[PDB]
Every structure is written in structure tokens, then in C-alpha cells.
From TrEMBL, chain C:
One of its GO terms (biological process) is photosynthetic electron transport chain. The chain holds residues 43 to 99 of 110 of the full protein. This is Tlr0636 protein. The lineage of its organism: Bacteria, Bacillati, Cyanobacteriota, Cyanophyceae, Acaryochloridales. It comes from the Bacteria. It comes from Thermosynechococcus vestitus (strain NIES-2133 / IAM M-273 / BP-1).
Length: 161, 392, 57, 53, 148, 184, 53, 111, 69, 212
């Protein structure tokens, strides 16, 4: 329509999982927009394609009040490589019901990394084992790293007086 | 009080943890001697570096970065200046890249010496724990000469290059150290490969396969210790590392002995890359280069875009351009990535530190399965964690 | 010769870490002269004892 | 001796060359306010080190 | 010697502005401000580099600007004068106060001269400055020390 | 066996005996240490000890505030519209909040801020670290002008070959700064 | 041989080399000398040097 | 379990105290203000903190008994104790061994 | 209405219903309502407010913000 | 009132009587505690490696009598060599309460003095260690040199010698104990000791594996 697809968009097109192919990166990798109902269908095909390395499962806030994003960068790891093919899958999710299906069963790399996405951002991962807070106290209530997080007036977080 | 029951006993390793790799807390549960589960409680050093970064410009944030992997130091400053300089397309000169290879390889040695000292005392002999401090204190003064403080908070890396050139008696002082240190690397190998009480603590203890290392997601000398041969200085042609000849150390065993030997052999290739970079340095010694700029100061082959430490002295109000980005630097303990996306303002929109210490630590429950109580410290000491890179 | 607070001197004694470094002096206390060296990136002033410094005109 | 095998000095600055360093390490323990743990035994805790030594 | 009496307190009653010379390893100065504190004198141990102009900090109120760190505005905390507000708090049964300026190696020679004459004009107030080092704890008046 | 057990002890107790020969030969070496308060090690030429300030050179630019990682130094200035030039009335950097990154001495137009050599700043009170403009404008404690401290040099300042600061009677840095100004 | 049997068995009851009271293997927190402070620890501290002598 | 919220001055434990040993409870919340004597208290101002302690425990008795929620009570208590210093009610203790002035230095009003 | 660089305060009725209440705690801290937060970098409907407390800045809507004169 | 954050008047006369014999038995009480004080081998953040470099051969730890005792009971001094977040702030007060009462914390680095570079905008960092524990000496740096902390030991050693023996009673905490009843629901402990054999790691659940 507007922007063309790449080698991973054409591969997912041939497997009848039509993805919204975003543009290239600033480093030159592919960005692919996948809805939160077609993620494990896309990830099961790319793991069988050869993308055996999930590198940097990052959660990203696309703006205050806009949809939260769970970016899935991933690369074709081999025994030797000369800039091997990589792709970043971007899964947009609303602030109301931030639920993305967990890809722990595809790559076990998303054990802490999807917890850190749930620790900082509010993104609940369905089908995640041990979905708790890692970096923060587990009894905390807020979601930091959002643009909207109002930090409490804790005595330890105040000035040094 | 303290009764004596028959169910498996859970011992809390505690956030106190008198060890040099930060503040970790493990709730490892025991079955007499074998462990059956272990949960790592992290985040005791979560200071919030991804939230600070959204309110810092790049020259404000460069002091912040060398505190995640505070064993390494300038490996964190490597990725941080690389993320707007590979997004704005700002050219780094060849001399500034060659000092970056010099600084990162001395950091990888100092990262490995900080891992080795605790690990040798964890696995047995603690008399080398006091002699690897002295080996690191020589690298401390090569960083104190060129950059500022000691080993971290050394604001050397910049967006257009590096902060300043080397001092006068500097290149002749690695060649006093890096030619003295390289005899002592093989002393560390014959400490563990010989005396085969240590090989019965490290063979098969924390063995992770090649197929499960890529799935769990590892990097550096823990991935490569399973025979994977994936090094991002070789895989990505990372800033004049392709101008040198050096072999990526692997081991096809997966155990802690394989993880030990790859790290000591990564010290040996680090001095190999150092000596190829001191002789391949464009201006060579700085006083040799500064003298050529005094005899031919108008327009020489020197005083060019290369043969200098910075491309352009960038303003504090340097706006990051718009666009997503993911930058890898092969740290001393794996891949340190950051996921930079910026808008037109001087603050990044999102700065996701992908640590090497993070993804290597999530297998420590799995590696502690069937191992004994005395082997728990030998596993955790060999993953080479730094709590602070884990937690940020 | 005496030293004026604001001229450029260079150090002269060899038993010192700053052998022939030079720069504009600053804050001459009645025994001590602090010389700003302008070295590379971070400008650093170290003091002396109103001697072992030769001015460069 | 443990400092000599590590090429550090050992205790200087107390006594001539550490001669009083066994004494101050033993005298600070007599001066410290030895308080029992909260939920513990009392008679078995005090005779703990006595039966050892 | 070891069994030092209270001769350090008598020199501070006489000179008023002492200049200690302590061993750099530390720990042997403070036995002489226990003899001073057993004789009624309260002690206020300051750090000599942290003081700015001594007239504006000690006998005058000073506007101490805290670290706003970009989040606050430029606050000005007017602290009360140090050697004055501390004299109005010790009881009249106790004697004066002694400024125990540690790290006095980095004060100007015109700052010991202000600290010398300040003990004259202020009743029941003395100073002890830990300028320099020596293998044995020895003292001398600050009027002697500004001469050499 | 009864002969195999008493001869399984000699194969180790000899190896222990040539382990004690190594550790006793570690005591042959001179203790390569730094006795601190009597041998203070000399800081480098780029060591960032603490900041020095020149009140007659600070023309209220607030570049130090904008490049500091935490916007630390408190520049207090009025505009002074009679002169139409902002003359500052107070300047202070609160050490203890300072990381010594020295961004302020680097992006300084007037060379007013400058790092000193002294690391020996340590107080009993936190608010005694809030250095004034006239407390930062003092004399750095130079290590070599102490008649109690024998200052030993640092590595990458010793001459070429030596890796210690105690057997150093004289010398300089490892290479000359302008030898090739008269030579080449 | 009997000097060597005495020497390894004596140092395994007084010294610091074959002793898990330093919990570097983290099998405990600090062993049985954990909650002992002050004058009771001085019996555990200095009484292990009476046992060495 | 001993849910606790221990800042410098406000130690709030979830339980009752029998002579140093704390037994974790579910109904009670013990509190000893200023364990290390940094402030010179009096009976007029200790009642003001103890009335504030009753005020926050009764207000926050709809939340969950976690260490986050005890840390919010001890935060508001330590914010209240500091307002009793800026009112000049209590003062710093000079008989304490340390004079670090954690709740701000003494300062005069409006120069 | 609200410029960049003016002291604002947050209205608590318009804040504790929207998407901005999901991120934070519901018991809002008292610095949010005393008017001392300085607005920086208005981006469309949302404004980033730098309160005088030393914690991270908050992006809030321009409906949830009231100017504190 | 008239002066904010005031200093209360010491109304006691502070009659610290001392003859020649008690002062000689007080110099031994202070010298034995300054010349052999034992630091807890503690540290969280980067600043512990500037403290662990002082254990090494170049800068000697056991030269001032410092023996690193990795237990809070056998140690007295505690050099806070690391940033204190919201976690580890209850852990640090626990290691400080588990100490014989001549304690002498020294702060270390900028992030225990005022929480230095995380003092601006960081949602879980204690801004200064003396929001939790009473400290004796401060130490600016990020990190300090190992020489710089040995000056803070020297500043600490000068502070032990000022301590009179008759002021041992003021080293104990006072219990102004108040109690109140609440109606907060007790939560089950979220951190239970099972990680691998939790009932969510063995197999992916249904209504998830259909899309796989
Ligand atoms: S940055 Fe330098 S020139 Fe600018 S106001 Fe500050 S001190 Fe003055
Ligand atoms: S010392 Fe560093 S952090 Fe502190 S004000 Fe100066 S530049 Fe900023
Ligand atoms: S001030 Fe620096 S070195 Fe010290 S704890 Fe903080 S980050 Fe680490």
C-alpha cells in the first residue's frame, strides 16, 4: 500500500500470516507490526525459519496515553556470521488491557525480559511462568518507565535536606 | 525455635552476600546436599537508569553509564556513544576508533581479572585473590593516565570520537604491562588445569548445552563456552576490529571448566588485539604525532580528519535524530545492547539497556539442578554477573 | 623573579610529575602559586611553592 | 606471615610494627556491648564458647 | 610519653588559638579533646576546607545555597553564625567552646590570623587547628604559627 | 593395601612440600604496597580530585549547570541592569552530590572551573561539603609539598621498564614531549 | 608418616585452612560463630589461637 | 515474616514487641520514634506524633498489609516529624555522638 | 492556555479516572496538588511537569492540569 | 518559630569528671577501638571495588587494624560501599541493628551521602544513607580512590578517640514504643521458594498452545 515489505514480511506473507510491515530501522533491520492475536503464530514460523536467538525483548511506550509496545528483536544465530539477518517484531497493545501472549515457550530468553516488561510497564504476559516483579519490591503498585508514573512521596526519595 | 523436619530445606542466600558481584539473593532449597529449586531475587540495585536516561542529554548521561557493568567500565560508554553516533551517521576518525579498541580491550582484561579473583577463591585457592588485584591496579593507572578517575567514571568515549588523546608515556607503558601481564595469563591456566582437585569441581558442574544456550539467550564467554563461536566483534564488523587477526575462543563442553578456560583465553586474545592496535595506531604515540604537527603544521598527512581524537567537538545541545535503533557491543561478559529510540529533542524517548548480565543469570536456576551446596558459589561465580548490570 | 597572577609559566624541577607543562597561573597565595595547565580535556590547576617555575614571554 | 605471602605489610601504625595488634584486637572485643540474639537460649549461648575453649 | 595530664587544656586557656600537629595516621589528636571535654569545654569539630570566608560563616549569618539539582529553585538557607549560635546553647555552668578544625593544612595564612584574633574578641571561645603533621602530637599558638 | 596406604601418603606430602617452597618464595619479594598517610601516591595529570573556582572569571553563563549530569552547581546571579551584565553573587557546588565527572570544567568557555589534585575531602557533617565560591577558590593540597609524606609515583608515569614507585631515585615519564622539536 | 598424620589432623581441628566457618561456599551464613559478638566471640577468636599453639 | 518500615527515625513493625524481640502479628503496628536519639523530644510533641500515628493507621486501614503500605505510613510519619523541626517544637540532640543533621540544618527565618 | 514554563497544579478529579491513573498509585502524593510543578515540553495533548520533588517527571494531560497562577 | 530546625539546649551540666587514672583507662578504651576496628565486608554498587582494592596488596587494609569480618556481629565499622535502593534499605538497617553498639558507619561515595547522581530523578534510591542509619564520617567521590577512603578511616580514627568511656550509656537505642490496631488485609507471601517446580514451567497451558 504505502511502505513495502522485506524478506521476513514476504516470508510471513507466503505462510498466510499477513503482517503490517513497518519501515526499516536506522541500523537497517526490519520492523514488523504484529497484532496481539497473531504473535505466537508469527513466532512459531520464525523460530522454524531459523531465528533461534531472541535478542532484547524490549517494551516501549509509544507516547503518554497511546498504545504500549512490546518490541521483539530477534536474529538468526549461527556458528559463524557476517551480519546475519535480523528482524524486530513490534506488538502494539493498549493501556487498557495491556496483555500480550508470552513467547517463553518459543524462546526461554523472555523469562526475565518479559518480567522486566511487566515490572516496569504494565504489560501482563499471558502464559508466562512466574510473572512477578524482578527489579522492584514485589509489593510495589506502580508501573514506572511509563510516561504517567507519579512517584510517591517516600521519605527516602526526598532531598538530602 | 529451629526444629528438624523431613521436608526439603530452603536456605536464603540473603541480600547481604559478601561477594564482589553485587547484591544477589537466592532462595535455594536443599535436599540434603542436592538442590531442587532456586529463585534469584534481583533488583536490590535497581536505581532506574532507563528512567534517568529519558531526562538526560547524551553528555549528561555518559557519566551515568559506566555503573551498570561497573566491573568493565568503558564497555558501557562504548554502547552509549555508539547509539546516537550510528543513528546520526556521525563519522568517528580512525585514530579515535583505535583508542576505543585499546580502551575496550584493556577493560575486557580488567573485567576478566575482576571475575577471576573471586572465582579462584570460590573454587579453592585464595592466595591468587591478592595477586590479581595487583594485576588490575596496573590497568587502573593506564585508565587514570589517559582518562580521569580510576576504572569507572572515566568519561572517555564521545559521540564524534573519544574525549582526549593518550598521554605521553602511555603506549610505552602498556608495552611494559601488556608484555609483563601475558606471562601471568598462562600462570592462571596452569592453576586450574593442573592440580586436579579443581577439575573435579568444574567438570560437569553447571553444564549447559549449545542448543539450550541459544534458546535461553546467552552471550560472550558463557554462550561461547558451549561451542557456539558467536562474537559480536567478529559477527558485526565493529569499529576497526576487523583490521586485526584474532581467534574467537570457544569450548565444546558447556561446563564451568569450559567457561573458565574461554575467559582466560579471552584475556590472551585481548593482549593480541592490543599489540596489533598499538603498532597499527595511525599517529602512533601521541608525542610522535604531536611532533609531526609541529614540524608540518600547515597541512600534512597528519592533522587530518583521522589522526585525531574527535571528529567534531559536539555541542551539549546535540539533538538525537528520530528513529529506532539497537546497538550491540561485545562486553567482557556478553552482549551489552541498548534499544535507543529518540525524537528530535535532546533526550531519548526510550533507552532500554539490554544487559549481558541479565540474560546469563536466568539460567542459574537451571544450572543449579542436581548440584551440591558447595557448588552453588562455583556456578554463580562462573556466570560472571555484576548486580547493577542485572538490576540497573 | 616574582610571579604575577595571570601570566604563563612552565615548571623546571625534574622531581615532579609536571616536568615542562605550562599554563596560566591563578590565585597566588603568599607562598603558593597554582598553575592552570589546560591539559587536553579537563583543565587542572596544581600548586607550587612560588619557585620552580620559569615564565615564558 | 599472611601479609608477607601477599606482599602487603601487615599491621603497622599500632605499636612499633603490630606488636599491640593482637592486644587491640582482643581488647575491643572485651569493650563491645555483647548483646544476645533476641529469640535464643541464654545459658546454652554463654557456655557455647566456654565448652570449646 | 603516654600519661599526658591536662597541660593541653592549660595552653588553650592561655594562648586561646592553638595549632596542633598530629601524626597523619590519626587517632591521637582526640585524646586531647577528651581532656578538653572533661574540663567543661564543649567541642565543635568542623572541617576547615568546608568553611568559606571565616567571618561570614563563624560570627555572621551565611546564606548556604543547597543543591537544588535541577528540580528545585535556588533556595537560600540562612544558617545562624557558627561560633555565636553555639555559644548561646551551652549552659552557663559549662565553659566555652573550642573549634576543632580538622584538615587545617588547606587554610590560608590570612585565615589563621583571623582565627587567632577571634578568640580575643569573643569571650569563652577557643580554636584548635590541625595544621601539618609530625610524628609526635605537639602544639603551639597560632600567633607563633603565622610567623613560621 | 598396608603397603599401598603408607605409600599413598608420600605422593601428596612431597607435593605439599614443593607447594610450601613456592609460598615461602612469595615472602622473598619486597612488599609492593603504598603506606598511605606517610607515602601518598601521586595523582595523575588528568585526575579529577575536586573542582576549583575563580569568582573573578565566572560570567554567569550557566553552562556548568546545563552540562552537569544532575545540574549540580548553584549559580546565583542578578542581572544588574545598571551595568546590563549579569554579575553573580554566589556560587557553590555541593560535593557529596558530586560525581567527579568534570563536565563543568570541560564545557567551560572562560576556563573558570578546573579540577584540583586533592581527593582527601571527607567530613563528619554532610552539609560541610557544600563548598562556597571562596571555599572552592583555595589552594589544592599538593602531595609533594608535605614534610611528612614521601610521594611515590603512579604507573604510566614511571620510566620505561620499571613497574614500581619505590625503587625510583629520579627519572621522568616514559617518553619525551618535544624531543623532535630540535631533532627532526 | 605419623608426624604427617598428626599434622593434618591437628590443623583440621584448630587452623583456618580446612575450615568451613568462613562460609565462602555459602553452605551457612557464617557458621556457628555467626551470632557471637563481643566477649563471647573473643573466646571463639582468641581461643582458636590457643588451640593452634 | 516481620513486615517492617525502618527509616532513621520512624521504625514501624507489623507486630508487638516484648523486650526487643518482635513477634509478627496481624492486628498491631508497633512504633518507636527516633531509636537513635537524634532529636530532643518532649511529652507535648511525642503526643503529636502518636496522634499522627493513630491518624494514618486508621486512614490506611482499607489497604493491604504489605511492606509497601507500611513504608507509606513511615514516610508520612517522617514527613510529619520534620515539620515539627521546622516549627521549632523539637530540636536536635547535642548529646548524640553524631551531628549529621539528617532533617536539614538549623537555619534562621527570613535572614 | 498552559504555556511551557509555568507553575501548574493537578486536579484530582480529572486524574483518578483516566489512563494516567493506571500507572501510578491511587493515593496521590501531596506535591502533585500544591502548585509548584513547572511545565516543560508540551507535546500535543500531554505536558511533562517537573515537580520540585527529586523524582522522575510525569507526563499528564492538559485536562488534568490547572495553572497555579 | 524564630529559627527553623533548632538545636535543643543541653540542660544537663555534663559533669564529665576524670582524674589521672580514669583518663589513662580511657585512652586504652579508645585506642583499642580505633586501632583494631573491623569492617563488615559489605557493599552493593560500584564503590565496593574501590573498597575491595583496599583489601589488596597495593593499599593495605590490615594496616590500621581493619580485618574484613563478613558477619554483622563480629564487625563494628560499616563502610556503606554502594547505592541503597528501596530494596536493601530494610536489609541495611538490619545489618546495622545486628551490631555491637560502638558502630561508626562511614558513608562512601556520592550515593550514600546524598544519593549523588540518582538524587535527581530515580524512583527507587535512598537519597543518602543517613536517611536510614546514623553516620560518623562522609566520603565524597564517585568512586573515591582507595587512598581517599583511608583518609576517611583516619577521620574516623580521630573520632573514636574523642569518645569518653562514661558515655557508653548513650550508645543504646531508646524505645518510645507506641502501638495501634489496623484493618489491613494480610497478603500471602509472593516470594515463595519454588521457581523451577512451580506449576507453570512444566508445560504451556491450554488456550495458549492452540495459537502456537
Ligand atoms: S560554566 Fe564556567 S564560565 Fe560558565 S558560568 Fe559556570 S563557571 Fe562561569
Ligand atoms: S563535578 Fe561533575 S557532576 Fe559535579 S557539578 Fe562538576 S561536572 Fe557536574
Ligand atoms: S557513588 Fe559511584 S562508585 Fe559509589 S556507589 Fe554510587 S555509583 Fe557506585
Amino acid at each position: 500500500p504505502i511502505v513495502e515489505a522485506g524478506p521476513v514480511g514476504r516470508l510471513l506473507q507466503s505462510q498466510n500470516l499477513s503482517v503490517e510491515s513497518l519501515g526499516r530501522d536506522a541500523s537497517g533491520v526490519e520492523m514488523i507490526k504484529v497484532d496481539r492475536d497473531r504473535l505466537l503464530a508469527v513466532c512459531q514460523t520464525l523460530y522454524a525459519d531459523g531465528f533461534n536467538y531472541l535478542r532484547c525483548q524490549a517494551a516501549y511506550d509509544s507516547g503518554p496515553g497511546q498504545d504500549l509496545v512490546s518490541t521483539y528483536h530477534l536474529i538468526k544465530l549461527s556458528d559463524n556470521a557476517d551480519r546475519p539477518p535480523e528482524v524486530r517484531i513490534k506488538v502494539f497493545v493498549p493501556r487498557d488491557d495491556p496483555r500480550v501472549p508470552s513467547v517463553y515457550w518459543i524462546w526461554k530468553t523472555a523469562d526475565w525480559q518479559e518480567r522486566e516488561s511487566y515490572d516496569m510497564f504494565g504489560i501482563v504476559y499471558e502464559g508466562h511462568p512466574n510473572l512477578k516483579r524482578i527489579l522492584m519490591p514485589e509489593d510495589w503498585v506502580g508501573w514506572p518507565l511509563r510516561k504517567d508514573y507519579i512517584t510517591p512521596d517516600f521519605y527516602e526519595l526526598q532531598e538530602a535536606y | 525455635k529451629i526444629e528438624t523436619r523431613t521436608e526439603p530445606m530452603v536456605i536464603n542466600m540473603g541480600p547481604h552476600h559478601p561477594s564482589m558481584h553485587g547484591v544477589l539473593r537466592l532462595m535455594v532449597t536443599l535436599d540434603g546436599e542436592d538442590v531442587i529449586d532456586c529463585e534469584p531475587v534481583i533488583g536490590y540495585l535497581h536505581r532506574g537508569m532507563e528512567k534517568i536516561a529519558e531526562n538526560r542529554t547524551n553528555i549528561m548521561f555518559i557519566p551515568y553509564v559506566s555503573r551498570w557493568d561497573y566491573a568493565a567500565g568503558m564497555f558501557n560508554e562504548a554502547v552509549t556513544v555508539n547509539a546516537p553516533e550510528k543513528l546520526a551517521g556521525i563519522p568517528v576518525p580512525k585514530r579515535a576508533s583505535y583508542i576505543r579498541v585499546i580502551m575496550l580491550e584493556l577493560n575486557r582484561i580488567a573485567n576478566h581479572l575482576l571475575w577471576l579473583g573471586p572465582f579462584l577463591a570460590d573454587v579453592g585457592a585464595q592466595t591468587p585473590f591478592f595477586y590479581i588485584f595487583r594485576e588490575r591496579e596496573y590497568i587502573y593507572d593506564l585508565f587514570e593516565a589517559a582518562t580521569g578517575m580510576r576504572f569507572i567514571n572515566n568519561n572517555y568515549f564521545r559521540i564524534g570520537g573519544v574525549a582526549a588523546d593518550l598521554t605521553y608515556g602511555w603506549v610505552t607503558k602498556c608495552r611494559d604491562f601488556c608484555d609483563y601481564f601475558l606471562p601471568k595469563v598462562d600462570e592462571y591456566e596452569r592453576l586450574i588445569t593442573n592440580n586436579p582437585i579443581f577439575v573435579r569441581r568444574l567438570q560437569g558442574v553447571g553444564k549447559i548445552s549449545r542448543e539450550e544456550a541459544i534458546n535461553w539467550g546467552l552471550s560472550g564467554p558463557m554462550l561461547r563456552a558451549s561451542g557456539v563461536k558467536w562474537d559480536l566483534r567478529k559477527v558485526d564488523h565493529y569499529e576497526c576490529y576487523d583490521d586485526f587477526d584474532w581467534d574467537v575462543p570457544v569450548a565444546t563442553e558447556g561446563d564451568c571448566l569450559a567457561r573458565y578456560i574461554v575467559r582466560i583465553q579471552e584475556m590472551r586474545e585481548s593482549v593480541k588485539i592490543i599489540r596489533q592496535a598499538l603498532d597499527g595506531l595511525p599517529g602512533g604515540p601521541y608525542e610522535n604525532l604531536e611532533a609531526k604537527r609541529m614540524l608540518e603544521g600547515a597541512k600534512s598527512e597528519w592533522n587530518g580528519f583521522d589522526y585525531q581524537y574527535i571528529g567534531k567537538k559536539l555541542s551539549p545541545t546535540f539533538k538525537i535524530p528520530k528513529g529506532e535503533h539497537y546497538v550491540r557491543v561485545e562486553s567482557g561478559k556478553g552482549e551489552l545492547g541498548i534499544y535507543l529510540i529518540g525524537d528530535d529533542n535532546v533526550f531519548p524517548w526510550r533507552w532500554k539497556i539490554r544487559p549481558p548480565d541479565f540474560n546469563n543469570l536466568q539460567v542459574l536456576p537451571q544450572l543449579l539442578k542436581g548440584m551440591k551446596v558447595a557448588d552453588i558459589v562455583a556456578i554463580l561465580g562462573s556466570i560472571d554477573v555484576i548486580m547493577g548490570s542485572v538490576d540497573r | 623573579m616574582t610571579i604575577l597572577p595571570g601570566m604563563t609559566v612552565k615548571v623546571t624541577n625534574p622531581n615532579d610529575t609536571y616536568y615542562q607543562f605550562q599554563g596560566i597561573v591563578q590565585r597566588i597565595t603568599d607562598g603558593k602559586v597554582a598553575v592552570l595547565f589546560e591539559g587536553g580535556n579537563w583543565d587542572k590547576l596544581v600548586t607550587f611553592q612560588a619557585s620552580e617555575l620559569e615564565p615564558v614571554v | 606471615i599472611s601479609a608477607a605471602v601477599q606482599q602487603r605489610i601487615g599491621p603497622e601504625y599500632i605499636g612499633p610494627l603490630g606488636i599491640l595488634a593482637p592486644l587491640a584486637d582482643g581488647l575491643k572485643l572485651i569493650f563491645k556491648e555483647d548483646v544476645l540474639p533476641a529469640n535464643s537460649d541464654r545459658w546454652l549461648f554463654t557456655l557455647g564458647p566456654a565448652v570449646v575453649v | 610519653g603516654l600519661l599526658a595530664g591536662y597541660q593541653f587544656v592549660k595552653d588553650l586557656e592561655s594562648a586561646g588559638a592553638l595549632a596542633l600537629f598530629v601524626p597523619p595516621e590519626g587517632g591521637f589528636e582526640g585524646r586531647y579533646q577528651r581532656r578538653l571535654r572533661s574540663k567543661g569545654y564543649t567541642t565543635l569539630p568542623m572541617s576547615a576546607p568546608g568553611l568559606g570566608d571565616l567571618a561570614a560563616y563563624l560570627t555572621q549569618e551565611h546564606g548556604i545555597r543547597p543543591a537544588h539539582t535541577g528540580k528545585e529553585d535556588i533556595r537560600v538557607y540562612f544558617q545562624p553564625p557558627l561560633v555565636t549560635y553555639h555559644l548561646e546553647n551551652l549552659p552557663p555552668n559549662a565553659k566555652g567552646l573550642v573549634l576543632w578544625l580538622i584538615d587545617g593544612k588547606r587554610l590560608s595564612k590570612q585565615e589563621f590570623a583571623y582565627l587567632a584574633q577571634l578568640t580575643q574578641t569573643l569571650p569563652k571561645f577557643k580554636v584548635v587547628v590541625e595544621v601539618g603533621g609530625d610524628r609526635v602530637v605537639r602544639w603551639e599558638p597560632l600567633a607563633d604559627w603565622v610567623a613560621a | 593395601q598396608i603397603t599401598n596406604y603408607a605409600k599413598e601418603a608420600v605422593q601428596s606430602a612431597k607435593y605439599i612440600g614443593q607447594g610450601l617452597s613456592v609460598t615461602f618464595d612469595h615472602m622473598r619479594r619486597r612488599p609492593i604496597t603504598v603506606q598511605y598517610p606517610y607515602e601518598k601516591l601521586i595523582p595523575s595529570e588528568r585526575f579529577r580530585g575536586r573542582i576549583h573556582f575563580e569568582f573573578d572569571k565566572c560570567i554567569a553563563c550557566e553552562v556548568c549547570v546545563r552540562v552537569c549530569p544532575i545540574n549540580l552547581p548553584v549559580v546565583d546571579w542578578v542581572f544588574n541592569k545598571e551595568l546590563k551584565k549579569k554579575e553573580l553573587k554566589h556560587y557553590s557546588i555541593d560535593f557529596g552530590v558530586c560525581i567527579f565527572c568534570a563536565n563543568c570544567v570541560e564545557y567551560c568557555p572562560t576556563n573558570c572551573l578546573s579540577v584540583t589534585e586533592e581527593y582527601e575531602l571527607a567530613t563528619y557533617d554532610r552539609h560541610e561539603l557544600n563548598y562556597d565560591s571562596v571555599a572552592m577558590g583555595r589552594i589544592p593540597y599538593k602531595v609533594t609539598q608535605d614534610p611528612m609524606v614521601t610521594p611515590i609515583r603512579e604507573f604510566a608515569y614511571l620510566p620505561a621498564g620499571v613497574m614500581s614507585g619505590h625503587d625510583l631515585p629520579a627519572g621522568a615519564q616514559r617518553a619525551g614531549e618535544r624531543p623532535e622539536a630540535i631533532a627532526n | 608418616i605419623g608426624f604427617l598424620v598428626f599434622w593434618i589432623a591437628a590443623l583440621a581441628e584448630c587452623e583456618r585452612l580446612p575450615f568451613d566457618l568462613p562460609e565462602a561456599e555459602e553452605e551457612l551464613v557464617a557458621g556457628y560463630q555467626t551470632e557471637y559478638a563481643g566477649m563471647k566471640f573473643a573466646l571463639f577468636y582468641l581461643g582458636a589461637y590457643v588451640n593452634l599453639v | 515474616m516481620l513486615l517492617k518500615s525502618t527509616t532513621r527515625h520512624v521504625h514501624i513493625y507489623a507486630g508487638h514487641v516484648v523486650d526487643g524481640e518482635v513477634h509478627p502479628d496481624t492486628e498491631t503496628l508497633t512504633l518507636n520514634v527516633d531509636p537513635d536519639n537524634e532529636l530532643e523530644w518532649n511529652e507535648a510533641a511525642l503526643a503529636k506524633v502518636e496522634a499522627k500515628f493513630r491518624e494514618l493507621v486508621a486512614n490506611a486501614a482499607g489497604e493491604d498489609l504489605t511492606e509497601y503500605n507500611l513504608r507509606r505510613i513511615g514516610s508520612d510519619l517522617e514527613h510529619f516529624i520534620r515539620s515539627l523541626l521546622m516549627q521549632g517544637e523539637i530540636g536536635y540532640n547535642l548529646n548524640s555522638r553524631v551531628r549529621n543533621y539528617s532533617l536539614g540544618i538549623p537555619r534562621v527565618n527570613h535572614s | 492556555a498552559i504555556k511551557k514554563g509555568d507553575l501548574v497544579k493537578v486536579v484530582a478529579e480529572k486524574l483518578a479516572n483516566s489512563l494516567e491513573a493506571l500507572a501510578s498509585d491511587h493515593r496521590y502524593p501531596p506535591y502533585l496538588f500544591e502548585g509548584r510543578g513547572e511545565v516543560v515540553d508540551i507535546r500535543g495533548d500531554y505536558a511533562q511537569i517537573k515537580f520540585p520533588v527529586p523524582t522522575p517527571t510525569v507526563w499528564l494531560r492538559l485536562d488534568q492540569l490547572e495553572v497555579a497562577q | 518559630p524564630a529559627i527553623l530546625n533548632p538545636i535543643a539546649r543541653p540542660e544537663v551540666p555534663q559533669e564529665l569528671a576524670e582524674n589521672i587514672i580514669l583518663t589513662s583507662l580511657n585512652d586504652v578504651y579508645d585506642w583499642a577501638r580505633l586501632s583494631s576496628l573491623w569492617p563488615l565486608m559489605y557493599g552493593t554498587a560500584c564503590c565496593f571495588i574501590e573498597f575491595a582494592a583496599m583489601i589488596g596488596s597495593r593499599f593495605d587494609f590490615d594496616r590500621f587494624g581493619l580485618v574484613p569480618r563478613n558477619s554483622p556481629r563480629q564487625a563494628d565499622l560499616i563502610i556503606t560501599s554502594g547505592t541503597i535502593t528501596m530494596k536493601m534499605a530494610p536489609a541495611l538497617v538490619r545489618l546495622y541493628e545486628q551490631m555491637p553498639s560502638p558502630k561508626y558507619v562511614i558513608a562512601m561515595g556520592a550515593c550514600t551521602i546524598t544519593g549523588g547522581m540518582f538524587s535527581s530523578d530515580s524512583y527507587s534510591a535512598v537519597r543518602g544513607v543517613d536517611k536510614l542509619i546514623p553516620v560518623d564520617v562522609y566520603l565524597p567521590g564517585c568512586p573515591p580512590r582507595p587512598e581517599a577512603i583511608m583518609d576517611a578511616i583516619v577521620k574516623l580514627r580521630k573520632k573514636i578517640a574523642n569518645e569518653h568511656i562514661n558515655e557508653r550509656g548513650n550508645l543504646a537505642q531508646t524505645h518510645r514504643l507506641f502501638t495501634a490496631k489496623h484493618k489491613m488485609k494480610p497478603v500471602p507471601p509472593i516470594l515463595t521458594g519454588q521457581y523451577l517446580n512451580a506449576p507453570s514451567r512444566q508445560a504451556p497451558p491450554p488456550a495458549l498452545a492452540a495459537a502456537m
